[PDB]
A paper describes a structure:
Toxoplasma gondii is one of the most significant parasites that impacts human health, with estimates that as many as one third to one half of the human population are infected. At the Center for Structural Genomics of Infectious Diseases (CSGID), the first Toxoplasma Structural Genomics Pipeline was established. The enzymes selected from the TDR database as small and tractable for expression and crystallization included: phosphoglycerate mutase II (hereafter referred to as PGM), nucleotide diphosphate kinase (NDK), ribulose phosphate 3-epimerase (RPE), ribose-5-phosphate isomerase (RPI), and ornithine aminotransferase (OAT). The genes encoding these enzymes were cloned, proteins expressed and purified, crystallized, and crystal structures were determined.
Phosphoglycerate mutase II, an enzyme at the core of the glycolytic pathway, catalyzes the transition from 3-phosphoglycerate to 2-phosphoglycerate, an important preparatory step upstream of enolase and pyruvate kinase. The P21212 asymmetric unit comprises four PGM chains [~0.4 Å root-mean-square-deviation (r.m.s.d.) over 240 Cα atoms] assembled in two dimers with BSA of ~1,900 Å2, while four chains bury a surface area of ~ 6,800 Å2. Eleven salt bridges, 15 hydrogen-bonded and 236 van der Waals interactions hold the tetramer in place. A sodium ion-binding site (e.g., NA 301/A) was identified during structure refinement. Tyr155, Val158, and Asn160 coordinate NA 301/A. Residues 12–257 (chain A), 15–259 (chain B), 15–257 (chain C), and 17–248 (chain D) are present in the deposited structure. TgPGM has an α/β/α-sandwich domain that comprises residues 12–107 and 169–257. Lys115 and Arg132 of this motif comprise a portion of the active site and together with Arg25, His26, Asn32, Thr38, Glu104, Tyr107, His199, and Asn201of the α/β/α domain shape the entrance to the active site. An interesting feature of the structure is a “scorpion tail” segment (residues 136–168 belonging to 310-helices η3, η4, and η5) that lies on top of the α/β/α domain. The tip of the tail possesses the sodium ion-binding site. With the present crystal structure, further structure-based molecular design approaches (such as virtual screening) is possible given the favorable SiteMap score (0.98).
Numbering used by the authors:
A (entry chain D): 17 to 248
B (entry chain C): 15 to 257
C (entry chain A): 12 to 257
D (entry chain B): 15 to 259
Write the structure that this text describes.
Amino acid sequence: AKYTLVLIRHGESTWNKENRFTGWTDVPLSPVGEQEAVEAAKALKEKGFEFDVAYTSVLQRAVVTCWTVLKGTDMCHIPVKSSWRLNERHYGALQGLNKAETAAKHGDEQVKIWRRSYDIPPPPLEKSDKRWPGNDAVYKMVPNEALPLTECLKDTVERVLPFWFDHIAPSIMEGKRVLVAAHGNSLRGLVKHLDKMSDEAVLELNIPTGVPLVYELDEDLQPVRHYYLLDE
Amino acid sequence: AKAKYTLVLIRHGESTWNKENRFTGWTDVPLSPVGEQEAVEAAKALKEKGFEFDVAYTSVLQRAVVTCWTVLKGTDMCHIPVKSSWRLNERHYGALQGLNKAETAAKHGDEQVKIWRRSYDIPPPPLEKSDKRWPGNDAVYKMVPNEALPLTECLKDTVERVLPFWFDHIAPSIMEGKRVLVAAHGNSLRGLVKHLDKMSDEAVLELNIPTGVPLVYELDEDLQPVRHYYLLDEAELKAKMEA
Amino acid sequence: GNMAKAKYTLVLIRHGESTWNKENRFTGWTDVPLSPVGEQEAVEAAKALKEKGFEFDVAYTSVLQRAVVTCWTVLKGTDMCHIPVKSSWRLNERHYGALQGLNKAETAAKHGDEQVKIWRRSYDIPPPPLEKSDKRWPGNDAVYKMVPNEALPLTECLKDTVERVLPFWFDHIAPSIMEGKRVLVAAHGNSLRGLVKHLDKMSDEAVLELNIPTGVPLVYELDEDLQPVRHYYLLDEAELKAKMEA
Amino acid sequence: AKAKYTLVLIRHGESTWNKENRFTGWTDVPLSPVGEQEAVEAAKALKEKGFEFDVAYTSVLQRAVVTCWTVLKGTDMCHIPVKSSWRLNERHYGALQGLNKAETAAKHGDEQVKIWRRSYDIPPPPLEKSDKRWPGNDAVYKMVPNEALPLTECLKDTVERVLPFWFDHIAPSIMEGKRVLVAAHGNSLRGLVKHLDKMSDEAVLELNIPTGVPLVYELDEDLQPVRHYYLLDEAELKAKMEAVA
Ligand code: NA
Ligand code: NA
Ligand code: NA
Ligand code: NA
């Protein structure tokens, strides 16, 4: 009843179509992904939503989603803050591999666990591997110890919260209308916190792609209600 | 001397109002389709010659902001921080903003507009605080004190408004070792160049910065230009300067 | 005066006496410390702010020890040590060029008595400039390593000081006030005269008569548009009249 | 073992409650006169060895903040930016804060407190939101979401609360080439050290950081410790370690 927060998950990426684990792989949006953001922007525009600051991960797919939304809402003048803390969950040694070839290699049960589990991460990369963010110039200014070799949702949540408490939440408290453009697991991290969901309950939480999720929060940042801005 | 640092400046391409032959100033109009493509072309040239960036500075006007995004996209630099500031905005055209050039030329005279357009210290007629074109009435600038928001501006004012941002943000980034990109407008960039090259008040009037062409500055240890150049062959560049 | 209310409250304070104020010597950007009396003026200003219940959310200071320590002392005495403090060379004292470090008598005998009165009280006539080879030039000082040399003065008149202060007002101080933050500004005589000149829309001629006393909180009650509704010092009319005379 | 960066850590000296033999935690108590002087002495040692700083990090508790200012004053480094954060605060002692050791011994028992004091993952009894010692009720933390403010903490929680600040601010400054100073507390510094030296959960329990003594870390290109040392002779240092034992 006091503050309004808008969250959005980027649309389909090239690897979502190629049926391959992405994680921190910095792949671009597919043409369909680019358009989901254009549609979400129009809906926000129609309802008169406006923003004062935007937060994003550092992955192209989220960054472009955010730019598209600002463009479609006439909010290109606002500051945009990116952080690796809003990045998708890192899939370790599975990143870049096709899901079928990994399912046939490791088994259908084991991948379902790695995909939908809360605290069991996929096999870790080695520091010599090029998929390790520690070897990527994009993370040059981030200490290597903070860059994951692999992650379970749990790790993702713990890595996201600090950014919520140190940047996002304070902006809301300062009176700013905030937009957050991120990924499925990163956003599940925020929602888990916002709605105080249990470890078991977030496993069933599915955040649809390219649909604005609006949170009406009270004076103490507790949700009064939430809803998606569409009719599909 | 020799280059120690590299700075890249870029002026946004054509806007809808450039085609509609209308004074823009702080009017937040979008790029035309041709303007969007000039940025794509400038990105490729930067990509080809191996330019990379660590931070990007922009005005708060859509035109420049989108030009910047396009260049980062085309150079695979979408991960970098982007900082916007009203200080990099185009020169404010006062009471002329939104008016067609022919209709103002016929109203006020061909001489008087030429003065207001290419003069250094004579600004166009000022707006009143009641006018909606005054940034002080625009929510975009709600966090900026109204005293800093112009009613009108001459190039001189624009230069004075830009320098502080150069000294407080852009230059320090260069000094910190960061490869900087600046996406702004004609007059705001003339402001930086005037300072960089220590141009006189009279000389900057002849300075014409072509639209959608990266301008690269090789600076020494003390931020003084060793040389500058545009990323385009003499053929394409000659045609861009003439427009 | 105006009977309206304050929307915002801003507190400005000029640091107390420095070692060189006693040595009767031009300081400018020379980073000299406060005298023991200077340290105590800040303790007294803190107590007055404490008694009236003033609280702060952020503090702005120059990068000169003198102002910095004044600010720390005030935060300590008001139980505001938890707030962010932002420093900037833009709030530095006016730079006195080639006069910095010299005694008044020895500069008066060297350059002339009246010429110094002009350099000290004038608005637009600066003192003789330093050379880039001189150590008193901030461009050679590690303290300003991250600030482009072109921005660092060789000398300054009040006018120059005002022009370098304003941007910091518009880019940091004012926005904090607009965000709803109770701001404290600990700086120097000329830098504060710069802010006041702007706040009260004073003329070039009028700011020459403006004397800001040392170690006395100056409170500004500003309206929604940052225009002064009224201002006042936290001191009895007795101690205050004596502070202004100095 | 090739050092590149230098980091200086300092634990504030004695507080009024250290003398009054009482659990402090987030209680914002001031330094004792002896505490103020330890910082003056640490500043002189840093001054003598020529240490200079480019930025300083601190908790938001007066005792640490004043320690930092004193060190900057004594090293002629008052011009540098100082960033404070609740993330560097002392460990929060939950329901034990404000209690005297005798008063806690009489009301919680000698065994339970020894566990709460030297344990890694078992926190002291938690406060209720209706308790005034909960930071959520303190204006100092007005700009920090209440969900982040502890009701109680074990060293483990402290560590988890500190790391993000290390990775988001302190470390990047070191990587940017800045000479950093960190003025904080016993448990918050044990957090950093535990990470820096990759100490095990069991080993940090024996780690004792003396008060008012600069701790210098020589780190390699990848922020890994090459070596560390205190600015004090083995004689004066032996006596400081016994004080903190
Ligand atoms: Na890295
Ligand atoms: Na405004
Ligand atoms: Na410098
Ligand atoms: Na709070």
